[PDB]
Structure formats: C-alpha cells, structure tokens
RNA sequence: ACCUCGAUGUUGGAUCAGGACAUCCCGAUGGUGCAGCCGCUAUUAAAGGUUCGUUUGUUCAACGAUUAAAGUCCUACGUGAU
RNA sequence: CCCAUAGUAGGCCUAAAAGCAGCCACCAAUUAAGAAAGCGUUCAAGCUCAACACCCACUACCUAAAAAAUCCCAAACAUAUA
C-alpha cells in the first residue's frame, strides 16, 4: 500500500470506517484500516486523523471519505475487497 | 584398416520371444533355405562378389535353395546384409517322379506339389 | 584429407548420419 | 509458521597444508631432446585414470577432448586463488603438468626441411576426467558457481559436479539408457555388421558405442 | 459474477458492490476423476483455435483473461488457451470484446486486413530480404508450437514451418 | 547470395545432407528384413 | 465417451454405415437377374472388350 | 542502450521487458543499465 | 600450383562509375567521469562530397591553408580493341 | 504481494574506518532480524533480503540466434483418413 503514500494525503479532512467484529464479511475495511494508518501514509501530513468506530449491531462496513473541497465520498465495503477500494480512494484522492 | 569383419556367436541366438514374434521352432528345424540377392554387388568388398557369384546369385530377385550346415550357415551370414534369408517348408510330401513337370514354387516359400490353373 | 580429430566438428558421413538419426533415443 | 531443518555440520572435514594451488610450469625440469608426434589417440574416448574423487567432494567433469598449455593453468591457478576461502577451501590438481611437445616451424617457410623446434608444452585430456578437485567445509551453491564461471572459460565443455550430481547424472543416463523404445541401438549394429555399416564407420565406434566423435561427448545419443 | 456500481447524488459518491448471478458447470460430466476442467470433458488434445466456444469461457469481455487459481487448468492447459485467444483477437473472432477507449477509433488507418493463425503480432515482425541461400531458408512460422499433440487426420505432421 | 566453397561434397566446408523420413522406413525395413535373416540363420 | 462438438473432435469425413448383408445380396441378386434376363432378350448392341493377348 | 546477448539486472530497480521482438532492461533509478538484445 | 607459357598485358594519374558499413557529416535516439560551444558509447538511414599544392618514381611516405570530410574494401590489387 | 527496534563508536596502526582493510572466539532482549546476504559511504546518513507478525498459483523446461562487395530467389498449402 505505498501508492498511497507516494501520491500524498493532504487535502484529505477526516476519515474514518465502521464495521463489526464478528460478520465474516469485515477482513477487506480491517486491511484497508490497517494499511490507511501506516507509517508513512501517518507521517505525510499532520493536518488529518483517523476515528476507528466499532460497533455490534452495525451490520454493514460502510467507509465514508472527505477531503478539504467539501465533498463526501462513502463507500461501503460489504462485497468489495482491500485493492479496489484503495485504488478508488487513490484516484478520488488524485483527481480533485 | 578396413579388413574382414567377423562376426561373434552370441549375436546368433535363438530366444523364446523371437520364436513367439516369428514363425519358427527350435526343436525340427528345417533343411533347406531360400536366399533371394537384393541388394547389389558393387560398393562392396570383392570377398563379397566372389561369395555371391559362387553362392549362384547372379541376378537379383531369384530364388535358390542350399543346405543348412554351418558353412552355407556361415557363407549366408556373410553376405546378410545383400541377400534375404527366408525358410524352405513342405506342406505336403516331397515330389515324386511323376510329379515333376507338375510344380510351383509359390509365396512365401511354399512349394506346392500339386499346381493347377483353377479356382477352387 | 583431413584428421581424425579436428575442431570444426566435421560432417560425418552420409550413412553414418542416417545411422545416427534412425537411432535415436 | 514453516518449519527449520538442521544445517548440515562440518566436522569430519579437515583443511590441510597450503590450501591454495601450486605453481606450474611451462618446459620441465628436463627438455626432450627428440621430438615427438602429435599423437591423436590421447584425446580421443573416453577417459581411463582420474575418472572418481580422492578427497575432496567438488570436480569439474569435462565433457570434450583439448590440450591445455602453461596459459591456460596459470590463469586456473589465479582464477581459484583469487575466488575461493583459504580458511574453508582448498583444491588439489589432479591433471598432471604439460609435457607433450610441439613442434613450430618458421613464419612464411617452405614444406619441407624437417620438423620444426620444440615451443611449448600441452596435456592431455580426454572426456569424462576431472581437471580440478576441490574441497572443503562449504555447500554448494557457491563451489558450483566459481567452478562453472572457469569450466566456461575452458576450451572444451566442462560442467561443475559434485559426488551426488554425478551418481544422479549417471543414474539418469543409465535410465535413459535401459528404457529405449526403438530396438535398434548403435551398438547392435556395431558390433553385429547390419546393412554392411562397417565400411563407414571405426573400429574404435566398437568401444565408443556412438558416444564420441573426434573429441566431442554427445550425452543424448544413447 | 460481481461488479462495481458508482453513482453521483448531491456530491455523494455512492460506491456499491453488487453480486449478480452466475451459470455453473453441468452436473453430468463425462469423466468426473479429471482433475482439470479440459480433461473432464475428454477435451485432451481435441480443439482448435476456432472453438469461439471455449475460449470465451475462459477470458474477460474486456480482451483480459484469467488465472489459473481461478478456473481450474494446469500448467501446460493454461499456455494453450493463452495462446489460442491471441490468434482469434487478429482473425477478426470475438467481436464483442473489444477493449474499451474513449474516442480514439476516429482515424481508420490500414483497412481490415484478413488474418488467420496469426502466430506473431503484424506490426512488429521485420521483413526477410534475403531469405538465405536455399538449405538454410528462413520460413515463416505458423500455427502454435503447443498445439502439435492434437489429433491428426491427414496422415502428416503439422507443418508449423513453411 | 549463399557461396559453396569448392565441391559440395568432398572437402572441408561442404553442404551437409541430411535425412528425411523415406531413409529412415527405408532403413526401418532393412534393419527389420536383416534381423529376420538373422533369426533364421540362427539353427 | 461424450465429447463435445469443436473442431477437432469429430472427423473430417462424414461417418459413413454399412447396410445389412442379407438385404446387399438379395439386391445383388436381383440386379444379377435383371442383367440376365436383359441379356437373354437381346437389348445390347457394339460391345467392347479387354483381352490380355500377348502381354 | 548496450547490446548485450546475456541480459541480466545490474542492480534492483531493473525490469525486465519485452517489446519489439527484444528484450530490454529499463531502469529508472540507475539509468546506465540500459541494456538491448541484438 | 586447380582452365590459363599455339600469350591472364603489371604500379599510378585523366575520364567513367556500381555495390557493401566495420558511418566524417547533415535525418532520428539513450547514457555519460554530459556544468553551455569543444568529446565518447550503442542503433536505423547511402539520396552526395571526399579539396587546392610541392618534392621525392608510386598504389606507400613527408609538409602549408578550410569546412561536416579530404573514409575503407571489392569491381582482372576496376577500367592500356581510350 | 508486507518489512525491519535496541546493549554500542563489539576489540585495535592510520585522525577515525561506526555492517563491507585483517584476525581465533563472530555474543546478546521482547514474538523477530546477520557484530552483517546485495548498491551509494575519509570517519556518520540513504535502500533491499533472510527472521516474527500476515496470506500463502506456477516461485522458474540451466546456458545453446551475427552482419561484405551486379539482385533476394521458383511459387504455394499447420485441418477428406499410409
Ligand atoms: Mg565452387
Ligand atoms: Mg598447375
Ligand atoms: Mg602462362
Ligand atoms: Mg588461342
Ligand atoms: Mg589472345
Ligand atoms: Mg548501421
Ligand atoms: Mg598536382
Ligand atoms: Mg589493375
Ligand atoms: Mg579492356
Ligand atoms: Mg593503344
Ligand atoms: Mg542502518
Ligand atoms: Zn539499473
């Protein structure tokens, strides 16, 4: 995942995902926490955060994304896996 | 120092599957042989020609049948490798007196006593 | 005439070849 | 988890004195004062003596006929000194110093007047003989890589095998050798005369049984 | 099958993922001990590169292809389909999977030139001037070296070279 | 535009000959008559 | 023993059957007749024929 | 380039490629290892 | 010494050119121990030029003045029924 | 496909060589990492690999091609049964 850290993440305002722990359907967000709070992907800006919510009763793992023009980016990973959500969030990231 | 090429005794074997392959026997063997010149005289040895014109196969495609001792035996392992070997059989008896100017030679080596010109 | 052993390979004869190739593993 | 084999000990190894190799020399103690042919026989087959191991686990099987002259062992020499651990390594020479002579004539001289003067000095080498025995306490990934980046530069083709590789290569060919489908071998005909092929071919093709020609090795001919 | 679905709503992308439905394999194959889905259909050395069939059943719509964890082959089975699918792209075969582009299919340079068993791709290949002497002639090459085991009718090799 | 030295046959650098598939059955038969003759002589 | 129809799978030529033997030669024989009985009631004319004569 | 029958990776960031009808060695880091099959 | 002693004219220069790159250049690339004009390496392309002079008998060889050059080999060591 | 803290500048001529200048022993802590397996370093920084943590396709049939001079040479067909 150092794609993400090679392009940048400072625009980006407030991040952060929710999923439950026992669905077996919630290992694609736990990878794609995993990989957003690295070292370096951490270390490019210190103008944004991340909020690691975890609940029971969710039962859906929806990630909602949003950068400083304003805008708002969701998407929930309930049958999408790790790559595609990270190279979608690469290029919304670098297209605006 | 190209001379004479012998040849061992243990190439000349028999051996139950080659018995089992072809149609032969070891316990019987026939008398008498059908040796048959295909291959030509010229680019070989002239110990070679000289077997060949004393075996009496001048012409090539013609039939001719010797004895079977050791010295046609050696004399036809000679000259292998310019003539073909094929057994003698006798489905019936042997020509009698009278019947002499009735005979064929046939395929496959089969001299037949009785020849005639009809169908069955 | 050349030698036994040379370091052009040398082609063999032709019934050697043909020996050659209708002997093959 | 993936599990951890044992590496293998070195411990019945023992290097010996001097563990780099001695100096050669191009004419011997004494110069042959009668000049003598240029034999090809001693090239030609298969190899008679130093064909096995002595000590060492690691050899470089040759796999053609050619002589070596004093060029050709200094820069072997220097190739081993310079890659290998005289702390680890040694190797001992297992082709005997050059002592076949050859006679030159003159540049730009006329075919006849006798033979020329002795120059230098070659050996030997058949197939199938080892030219350089080394041993040690190491593996053998890296002994097979600095013998095959000098069997490379060898004239004739030369591989790096060792005591296993050469038992399995043997095996294979044996193999190889005893499963044929075609029931005509290069030695049934030899030996038994077919289709008059001993106009053609050698008497020593008796011995060789197809598997050299000159001084080349042709491992696939069965 | 699964697939992606990005809609805009208010400056709200909204990312689903959908899974939609998909055929199966048969539940009567001829040979069930195969273990490779060629195999169990006694389709041993038995297609050609014309089978538009079975080629499209193991690529993308897009001109893709896919692993071999995924549909099942070997390690030779896989090279021979791979090599199959080129030489239907350049015949003109498979029509509907093309790749996508957003509008670069404006200038029509060389018309449709026909193709068949197109081993090589066309612009890349230099053209033989000298052919060689007449022992040693530089043919061209045909067909597909993977595709010499299959059944034969005519009583000759394949001749790949020619 | 390829140049044979001199003679294609005897020589040094001479065009090499090489073997089809009629040598070869051609061969095949002999081999095959030729052990046949061997097995008859064998008695 | 079910394999599908490619290219490769089913031969070039087309499967050719053999009919029955008993009703061939009672063809065979009916076909013999009618030549027979056409040749007994004169219906040919200019014949040819290829006599082996002297080689 | 360099023509090169024996191709091989000089240091880390070389990959190889094939395009036509050659193989190449390009690199980004070391450009000096540029390399082409003749 | 394989046709050539009942005969294959032998070094240059004038005139006439043809083919090939192992290319000096203008056409197009990558790197550099490429800071920019001066250099080098590897690839494709022959549509042209390859000077003005001296003396030594020269195809060899020597020296004065230019641009991108005074390039190489074969054509009976090209061409004397010119 | 990811992944890397520390007892230290482990012992010594040269000013020091701190993991790549030489010697015998090449220690030692939590899961797990070499007093150093491959580039850039007078003495320090920059990058990977082996070892956890993590999933776990083949993780490799070993290497075997070339360009001279009038212009390159017959053409063609991998699929109706030796
Ligand atoms: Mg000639
Ligand atoms: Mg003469
Ligand atoms: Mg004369
Ligand atoms: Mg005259
Ligand atoms: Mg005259
Ligand atoms: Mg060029
Ligand atoms: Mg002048
Ligand atoms: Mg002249
Ligand atoms: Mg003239
Ligand atoms: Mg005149
Ligand atoms: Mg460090
Ligand atoms: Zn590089």
Known sequence: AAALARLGLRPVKQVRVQFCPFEKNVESTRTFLQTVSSEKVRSTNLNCSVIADVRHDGSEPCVDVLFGDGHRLIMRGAHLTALEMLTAFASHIRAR | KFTRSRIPEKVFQASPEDHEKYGGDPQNPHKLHIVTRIKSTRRRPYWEKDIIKMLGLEKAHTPQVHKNIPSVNAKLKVVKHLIRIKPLKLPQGLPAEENMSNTCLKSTGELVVQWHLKPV | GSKAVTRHRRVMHFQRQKLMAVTEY | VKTLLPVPSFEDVSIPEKPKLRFIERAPLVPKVRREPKNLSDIRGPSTEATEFTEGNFAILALGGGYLHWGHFEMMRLTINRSMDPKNMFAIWRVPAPFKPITRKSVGHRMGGGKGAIDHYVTPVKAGRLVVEMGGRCEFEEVQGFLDQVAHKLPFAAKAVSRGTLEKMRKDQEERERNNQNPWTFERIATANMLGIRKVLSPYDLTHKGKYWGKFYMPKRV | ?162 | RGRIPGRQWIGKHRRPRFVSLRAKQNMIRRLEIEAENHYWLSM | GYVPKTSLSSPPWPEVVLPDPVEETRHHAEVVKKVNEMIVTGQYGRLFAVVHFAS | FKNKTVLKKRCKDCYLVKRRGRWYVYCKTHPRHKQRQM
Request: with cysteine; aromatic share 8%.
């Open chain 5, 1 to 162: 099958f699964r697939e992606v679905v990005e809609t805009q709503e208010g400056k709200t992308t909204i990312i689903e993922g959908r899974i939609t439905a998909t055929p199966k394999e048969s539940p009567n194959p001829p040979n069930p001990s195969g273990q490779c889905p060629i195999c169990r259909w006694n389709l041993k050395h038995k297609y050609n590169y014309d089978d538009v069939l079975l080629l499209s059943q193991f690529i993308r719509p897009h001109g893709g292809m896919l692993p071999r964890k995924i549909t099942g082959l070997c390690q030779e089975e896989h090279r021979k389909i791979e090599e199959c699918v080129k030489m239907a792209h350049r015949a003109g075969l498979l029509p509907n999977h093309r790749p996508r582009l957003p509008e670069g299919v404006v200038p029509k340079s060389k018309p449709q030139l026909n193709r068949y068993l197109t081993r090589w791709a066309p612009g890349s290949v230099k053209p033989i001037y000298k052919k060689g002497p007449r022992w040693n002639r530089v043919r061209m090459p045909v067909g597909s070296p993977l595709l010499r085991d299959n059944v034969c009718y005519s009583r000759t090799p394949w001749k790949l070279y020619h």
